[PDB]
Amino acid sequence: ATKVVCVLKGDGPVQGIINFEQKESNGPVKVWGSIKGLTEGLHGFHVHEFGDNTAGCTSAGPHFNPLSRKHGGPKDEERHVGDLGNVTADKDGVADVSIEDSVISLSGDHCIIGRTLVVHEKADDLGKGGNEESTKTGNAGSRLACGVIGIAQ
Amino acid sequence: ATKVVCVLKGDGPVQGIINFEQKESNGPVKVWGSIKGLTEGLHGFHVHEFGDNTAGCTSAGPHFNPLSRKHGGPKDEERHVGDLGNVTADKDGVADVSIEDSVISLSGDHCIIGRTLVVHEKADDLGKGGNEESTKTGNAGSRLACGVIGIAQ
Numbered sequence A, B: 001a002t003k004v005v006c007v008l009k010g011d012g013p014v015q016g017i018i019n020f021e022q023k024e025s026n027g028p029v030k031v032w033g034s035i036k037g038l039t040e041g042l043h044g045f046h047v048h049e050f051g052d053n054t055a056g057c058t059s060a061g062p063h064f065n066p067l068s069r070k071h072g073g074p075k076d077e078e079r080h081v082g083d084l085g086n087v088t089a090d091k092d093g094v095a096d097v098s099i100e101d102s103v104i105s106l107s108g109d110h111c112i113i114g115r116t117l118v119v120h121e122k123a124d125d126l127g128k129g130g131n132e133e134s135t136k137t138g139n140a141g142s143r144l145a146c147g148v149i150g151i152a153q
């Protein structure tokens, strides 16, 4: 019933299109699309709090964390709402994204509309990095590309 | 009390930053910012229905029109929610935007978060152009720049 979309762009050559679809306000969100221009391997994938691209991806602020929790992976009870883990780029630098998430929403509350989706330089350690930053950002490094999450037809 | 922001970009020289602020949920929205790279004179200024920039500004669809009205100017009863009239560029190609609007909102069914803000090639005739297109688009021509309307800090 609800469909939202995000175009990922940045200061480098990373670009992507990410779709989100939610059948019921109570339901899981299906996340699918493609990102290119990435280094092979894991890249942290998160919804950040602000849909503000004024100065590029830095203006999006921290991970979306309406419930004041620590950073984790998407399968964890202890996570930020915005914690979608990692996408994986192949040797051609392409990530084919296919995620199902029960914590993000497109309606009701915990809504990601108007926020920023960010793909990161490094792997998200999912809060298992063994340092203080692990349970805040997952040590995923800089913001390679981002976009504001908008309502689709 | 609620703040939202939009970065306008397109295929050519037009770029801008637009801020929106609403003190009360029932209250007027203040709209301010600047756009550059424009031809001198009036440029139609609209919130479009989809926050979909996947194929540039064309994917944003028609004017945001949750109340199924005809096109008009911001100071008309008969208007789309997204009808913000025109911004005015000077001989340097700069529009300094300063609008207060009582119809758009930053909450509820009039909310513009997750929609697209578009600045157009031509003047919006505010539905007074007398042709059929006047009461749909205002004859404002192509989409020079746009962005998804996001939540700000």
Ligand SMILES: *[Se]c1ccccc1C(=O)NCc1cccc(OC)c1
Binding pocket: A111, A113, A114, B002, B003, B004, B106, B107, B108, B111, B112, B113, B114, B151, B152
């Ligand atoms: Se408004 C609107 C329109 C479309 C989708 C979501 C929303 C919305 O109300 N989102 C929640 C929210 C939470 C914090 C701040 C905010 O605006 C600044 C909106």
Ligand SMILES: COc1cccc(CNC(=O)c2ccccc2[SeH])c1
Binding pocket: A106, A107, A108, A109, A110, A111, A113, B107, B108, B109, B110, B111
């Ligand atoms: C379609 O008509 C609407 C009716 C009420 C609210 C809205 C916009 N606000 C929301 O949808 C919203 C509000 C609070 C938390 C999360 C979300 Se997603 C639209």
Ligand SMILES: [Cl-]
Binding pocket: A062, A063, A137, A141
């Ligand atoms: Cl971060």
Ligand SMILES: [Cl-]
Binding pocket: B062, B063, B137, B141
């Ligand atoms: Cl149009």
Ligand SMILES: [Zn+2]
Binding pocket: A046, A063, A070, A071, A072, A079, A080, A082, A083, A136, A137
């Ligand atoms: Zn997090």
Ligand SMILES: [Zn+2]
Binding pocket: B044, B046, B048, B063, B118, B120, B140
């Ligand atoms: Zn328009």
Ligand SMILES: [Zn+2]
Binding pocket: B046, B063, B070, B071, B072, B079, B080, B082, B083, B136, B137
């Ligand atoms: Zn209109």
